[PDB]
Amino acid sequence: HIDLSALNPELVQAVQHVVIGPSSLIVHFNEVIGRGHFGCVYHGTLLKKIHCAVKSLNRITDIGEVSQFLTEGIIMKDFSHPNVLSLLGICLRSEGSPLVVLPYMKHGDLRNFIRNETHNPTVKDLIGFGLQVAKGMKYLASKKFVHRDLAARNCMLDEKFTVKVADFGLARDMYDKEYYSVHNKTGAKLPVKWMALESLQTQKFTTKSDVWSFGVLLWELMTRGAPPYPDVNTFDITVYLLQGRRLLQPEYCPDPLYEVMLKCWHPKAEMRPSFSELVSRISAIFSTF
Numbered sequence: 001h002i003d004l005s006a007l008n009p010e011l012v013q014a015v016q017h018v019v020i021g022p023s024s025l026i027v028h029f030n031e032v033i034g035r036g037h038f039g040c041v042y043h044g045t046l047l048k049k050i051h052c053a054v055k056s057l058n059r060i061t062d063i064g065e066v067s068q069f070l071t072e073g074i075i076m077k078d079f080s081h082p083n084v085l086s087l088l089g090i091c092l093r094s095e096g097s098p099l100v101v102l103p104y105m106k107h108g109d110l111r112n113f114i115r116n117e118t119h120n121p122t123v124k125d126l127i128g129f130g131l132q133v134a135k136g137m138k139y140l141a142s143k144k145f146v147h148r149d150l151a152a153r154n155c156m157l158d159e160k161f162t163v164k165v166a167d168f169g170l171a172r173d174m175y176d177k178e179y180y181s182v183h184n185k186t187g188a189k190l191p192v193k194w195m196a197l198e199s200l201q202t203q204k205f206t207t208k209s210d211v212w213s214f215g216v217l218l219w220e221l222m223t224r225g226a227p228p229y230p231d232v233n234t235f236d237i238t239v240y241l242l243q244g245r246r247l248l249q250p251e252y253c254p255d256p257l258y259e260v261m262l263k264c265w266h267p268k269a270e271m272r273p274s275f276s277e278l279v280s281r282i283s284a285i286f287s288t289f
């Protein structure tokens with residue numbers, strides 16, 4: 001049970017650009033495809049029948065939470081890139097929290113996809129995916145949008161095997177709680193093993209800290225979904241990194257790709273490549289395959 005007139009009126013305007021009428025949407029509450037802190041994700045169809053993922057915000061009880069979340073996430077509607085997850089719309093209803101409607105990604109997240117033993121993606125496949133992520137990160141960077149949680153678990157694969165950078169905006173949530181820790185300066189749950197050393201030190205996230213995360217993401221690809229720093233405690237990641245230590249070369253990571261990875265983790269944020277640079281670099285590496 002959530003009210004409409006209780007929100008900032010400018011936000012209600014923005015949301016109404018992308019409103020879905022309950023009549024247009026069927027949600028299958030028996031078909032859970034994800035569980036987040038804010039709510040579950042379900043199979044749904046938007047009618048002309050589009051298969052979608054429906055994110056419930058029903059664990060957000062309070063209106064001040066909903067407003068803040070919608071305010072921060074609504075910018076998602078003004079993004080359009082084939083390597084960025086789009087927003088189909090927000091279904092507002094008279095009783096219950098707003099439902100966030102997204103395109104259904106048939107192959108789920110990149111991490112579970114590449115970990116599936118029947119899939120056995122080749123080095124070429126894996127580099128391909130990585131290049132697709134860099135392209136969507138390039139777009140977001142150009143919009144001055146800082147992701148804050150770039151990771152393989154947060155990039156989706158559609159039915160055409162197009163990678164969509166996700167878990168941002170109205171989709172934002174922790175869908176794998178194993179990888180978020182309160183052992184950081186902010187005190188709140190953060191993906192510490194994906195975060196730039198400076199972000200751990202200063203609490204600030206930037207496009208250049210997203211590049212650091214992209215480096216970790218590439219490493220996840222080449223390892224086919226191994227968890228980074230398995231013997232480093234969340235208590236220790238900052239000092240591990242301060243000591244100049246880094247994720248080691250995956251067995252089937254080509255040397256130029258590891259080189260790229262090391263550049264992404266340069267202690268000096270100004271020294272790391274742009275996503276523009278990363279696209280060119282990985283594209284050339286891709287082309288050797």
Ligand SMILES: C[C@@H](Oc1cc(-c2cnn(C3CCNCC3)c2)cnc1N)c1c(Cl)ccc(F)c1Cl
Binds near residue numbers: 055109153
């Ligand atoms: C909000 C939710 O969105 C989707 C999940 C899924 C999804 C999850 N799993 N699967 C299937 C593939 C593997 N086996 C279970 C079903 C599809 C598809 N499309 C989505 N838009 C989501 C989840 Cl659950 C996890 C990470 C994300 F970045 C996002 Cl954005």
